[PDB]
Ligand binder design. Structure first.
Ligand SMILES: [Cl-]
Ligand SMILES: [Cl-]
Ligand code: NA
Length: 572
């Protein structure tokens, strides 16, 4: 009886809190005349002990009144959330789409009980309207579901990204919605309802009050977190990261197509190999054993049988440095040999363009340290390993040879990141195959820091201060648990690289729309895009200019170097 009171709206009154009510709301038509309209909404009987908007409109095919769309007139921002039947976008559907507009009940789109397009026209206009801020928690997740269900969205403020940046990698956990709301608003949402079955055709009264509340809280969170972001001078990094959601979604949705012929043929090749090595019976066996078991055995599990592609998961802020991380599969863990890389290929009538930054870590070090010899050397287009070779050997560039440059690579990568001369001996002889003496390495140390005075000043200022707070050129921030000299030198370089790559993906995303380019992959200091073969030379220019513009945003005293190649596979 009471349970059956609002089946008309596909709701179940399990308890006795849900009450339907009708009242007039304050609204305005296009002619700047106050049309105050009547609407039917739902409110709890037991009042919540907080100011979070718990009331809501529910939209369905039955009780659709067009005038709720006019709530969106002249808004500047709105809370946005969805409720899904699961996590995997391809294998799941959006159950609810909630829109929280300030000082009104939460508008909830019942997607399982709407089969007409005209209702969603109001929603689609809001989401496309670049002049509305969409406050979201877990913006990549929601944006993926919307983009896959043909919705379009621009202009996002992700409370997860804001909460992570403000945390400065002091915590691994505590970035769920209930955690963030408990922290910044001191409110405990009903986190049981995250697990509750949204695949039901009807929904219970507690589910929808959770639905509404978990969107309306975003308005208060937006005020608190935007203020906190501005206090900590994190607006530049937070703004880049929010804009970077959409390129990330483009990568996770586009995926990368796989050549199953060379994959299976290659897998049979490794079979014949390791069986033949057992017949011949550490070097070749563990090579084949890991190459098979790590690569050729696990990669078949990730490809989608229908589409012949891998859709990896890109993490945005789950690293110390701030660089992207990838998992399921970890794209950086793919072997760098060409025989395997060539398996990954474009789609039909498309082609890869692949661009790498060159020496960007060293250039960033020159920038931030103001090292005169390095900066003027880069401006003259003199290679830094050639430069160090000249300083060490005291020879001129026409006399420097490949052996000198090799020792110089060990000296630069060794000493720039904080190694002493003993660690330089072990580092060079291990990773570069030299046999340097400790007297020679001591000469390299004194000569290197005698000439590179900015780098020397950088190292001694860090070692003297023993600080824990460190930052990048985007003002991304980290707080160390304890002082580590090498980590302290590594953070501004690597974190500025992450800033450059992420902003490059933002500009690249906005620029590739005309040719309908697809962003595929970002690993280390490399970016891969797909375009139809007619836009080949064009997309070459778009990619290089986007990456250069990002590096030009952050770096003033040094011009980056992009190496770009067009390819029909990753291994080229
Ligand atoms: Cl600051
Ligand atoms: Cl901001
Ligand atoms: Na969400």
């Amino acid at each position: 009886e009471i349970t059956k009171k609002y089946i008309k709206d596909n709701i179940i009154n399990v308890d006795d809190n849900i009450i339907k009510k009708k009242d007039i709301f304050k609204l305005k038509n296009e002619n700047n005349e106050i049309t105050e309209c009547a609407f039917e909404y739902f409110e709890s009987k037991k009042k919540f002990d907080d100011d979070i908007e718990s009331r809501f409109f529910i939209i369905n095919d039955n009780n659709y009144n067009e005038n709720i769309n006019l709530i969106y007139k002249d808004i500047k921002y709105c809370g946005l959330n969805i409720q899904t039947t699961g996590l995997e976008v391809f294998d799941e559907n959006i159950r609810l789409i909630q829109i929280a507009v300030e000082n009104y009940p939460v508008i909830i789109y019942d997607m399982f009980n709407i089969n007409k397009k005209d209702i969603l026209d109001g929603l689609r206009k809001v989401l496309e309207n670049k002049n509305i801020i969409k406050i979201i928690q877990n913006g990549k997740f929601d944006a993926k579901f919307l983009l896959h269900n043909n919705f379009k969205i621009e202009n996002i403020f992700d409370t997860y990204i804001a909460s992570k940046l403000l945390d400065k990698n002091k915590n691994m956990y505590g970035f769920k919605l209930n955690n963030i709301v408990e922290k910044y608003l001191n409110v405990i949402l009903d986190k049981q309802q995250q697990n509750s079955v949204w695949n039901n055709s009807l929904l219970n009264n507690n589910q929808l009050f959770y639905a509404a509340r978990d969107s309306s809280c975003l308005l208060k969170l937006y005020k608190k977190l935007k203020e906190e972001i501005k206090k900590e001078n994190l607006h530049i990094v937070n703004d880049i990261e929010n804009k970077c959601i959409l390129p990330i979604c483009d990568m996770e949705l586009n995926g990368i197509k796989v050549d199953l012929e060379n994959l299976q043929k290659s897998t049979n090749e490794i079979l014949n190999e390791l069986n033949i090595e057992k017949d011949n019976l550490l070097r070749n066996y563990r090579r084949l054993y890991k190459l098979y078991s790590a690569f050729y055995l696990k990669l078949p599990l990730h490809i989608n049988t229908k589409t012949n592609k891998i859709h990896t998961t890109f993490n945005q802020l789950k690293t110390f440095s701030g660089r992207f991380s990838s998992e399921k599969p970890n794209l950086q863990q793919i072997p760098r040999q060409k025989n395997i890389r060539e398996i990954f290929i474009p789609n039909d009538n498309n082609i890869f363009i692949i661009a790498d930054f060159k020496q960007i870590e060293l250039m960033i070090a020159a920038e931030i340290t103001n090292d005169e010899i390095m900066l003027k050397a880069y401006n003259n287009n003199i290679d830094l390993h050639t430069l160090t070779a000249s300083i060490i050997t005291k020879k001129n560039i026409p006399d420097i040879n490949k052996e000198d440059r090799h020792i110089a690579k060990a000296i630069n990568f060794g000493l720039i990141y904080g190694m002493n001369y003993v660690n330089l001996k072990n580092y060079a002889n291990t990773y570069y195959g030299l046999n340097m003496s400790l007297d020679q390495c001591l000469y390299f140390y004194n000569s290197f820091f005698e000439h590179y005075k900015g780098i020397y000043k950088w190292h001694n200022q860090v070692k003297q201060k023993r600080a824990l707070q460190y930052s990048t050129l985007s003002n991304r921030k980290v707080i160390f648990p304890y002082f580590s000299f090498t980590k302290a030198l590594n953070y501004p370089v690597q974190g500025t690289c992450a800033d450059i790559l992420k902003l490059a993906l933002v500009d690249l995303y906005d620029n590739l729309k005309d040719i309908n380019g697809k962003i595929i992959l970002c690993v280390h200091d490399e970016i891969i895009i797909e375009v139809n073969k007619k836009f080949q030379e064009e997309a070459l220019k778009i990619l290089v200019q986007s990456m250069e513009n990002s590096a030009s945003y952050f770096l003033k005293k040094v011009k980056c170097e992009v190496s770009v190649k067009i390819a029909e596979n990753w291994g080229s």
